[PDB]
Symmetry: C3
Subunit: 182 residues, 3 copies
Amino acid sequence: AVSDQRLSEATLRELEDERQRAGLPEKPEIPEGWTIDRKPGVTHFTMRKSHGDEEIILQLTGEDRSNEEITRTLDVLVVNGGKALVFGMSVEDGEFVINNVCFRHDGKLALDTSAEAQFQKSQLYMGPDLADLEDHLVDSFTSYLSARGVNDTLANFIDQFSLWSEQADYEEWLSSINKFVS
Amino acid sequence: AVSDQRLSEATLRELEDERQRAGLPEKPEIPEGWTIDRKPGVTHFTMRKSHGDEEIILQLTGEDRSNEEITRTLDVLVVNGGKALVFGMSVEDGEFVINNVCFRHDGKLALDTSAEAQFQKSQLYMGPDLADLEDHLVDSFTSYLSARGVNDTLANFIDQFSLWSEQADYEEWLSSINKFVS
Amino acid sequence: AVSDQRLSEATLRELEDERQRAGLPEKPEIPEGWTIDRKPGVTHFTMRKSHGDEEIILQLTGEDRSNEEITRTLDVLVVNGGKALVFGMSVEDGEFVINNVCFRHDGKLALDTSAEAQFQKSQLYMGPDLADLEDHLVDSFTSYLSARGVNDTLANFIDQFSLWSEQADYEEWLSSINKFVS
């Protein structure tokens, strides 16, 4: 009873204080052509846009490693003709860093995000170590992504949008716990 | 043939020796009100108890990091009205340490332990970094858990019970391999 | 348009250059009695062989840790009478290293490789830390595996086969991306 009252008061106090703190991120305008699939409470959102016959899909996959600077991981899929080119990437200081480049003959499997689909794809070839590739190849991959809008502007939007939604999720977190304990 | 005979003899010898070794953990009495779901050979057991209209669920999730001292991870769910407050915790020297605090609007999903359910929840907001919260809030969370029996006594029971069942699982391990190879 | 042309040219160039590079692994002859389940583009293949009433199954599970020397992880299952002895192992310099030894009463579950099956098995007893076992026991386990063909010869075949298929997967990777971008 009392402990629940304390938690109720504490969450309300934080919600009120938080809203008065400076630094509250402003909501970024979504890049032209991109659609966004983001719901309150869901941190790993997805973005999509068409590129002629291809569809470009951006799926956040996580945040990693101890770090002073926040680095996010995401997959970029380019789907066309039932197949997909899948780029394993991370955003480091407003820029996209390619970590892996995989090719999926089974585009349907590539798009499937179920736990079972993830396991099946984990057994597939993950492409070469980027470090074993010459610049002409690596640069061509980066130019290919840039021609499709996957550039610093988009990487920049991802950080900005993530901060804003994290802030919104945090306040919704406080409010829902307050209601729950009340 | 011979190798199997050797393995058969070796496991029997260990089983006999083990039973004569000192330090065999004694079976802990389960805390009042708590029910326990533990079967031989299953290391990650679950504990449950009611708290009025709420149900409190303890699910061991693992053991981690290289360590001189054994640290276990577990989730503590407080379910009520179709929603759940989920505490990501670990037991460090008889005490509960809160690592994460999440809120799940979809209590049914929160309770679902399938691989698919885990993946879906991995994309949800994981709450704030405990380090960014003031003591008044953090202490209120700890008091809330304590009022429900999630205290040092329970943390202490978890270590004790885990040691005892590990010991039992080890002997059952020796015996089943012996029978298998025979 | 241009970026895609560049990527098309770059992949073709690499494919042509790669084929002229020395060091191309030669295809290993599969050990007697073993069957192999490997498809182009699939890195984690499985090997199987019968041993009287038992079936021995080798399933690659990954590659790990930063390393100058490539170390692979795999599970070795010995199934008989609806039960399985499961060895968690890794290949380090042509030799098998036992990391874990588990026993599965539910052989069907042991054989199930679905994401859901993996999660269920992750909650089971994982056997003792090999470091807490005397040589007589550990050596008996190694002899048991050796009598079934799981020896340095097989470990050696796994590295050799993996290198050859990695090389094949790499060239197929270049070719499929080239066709895709064209």
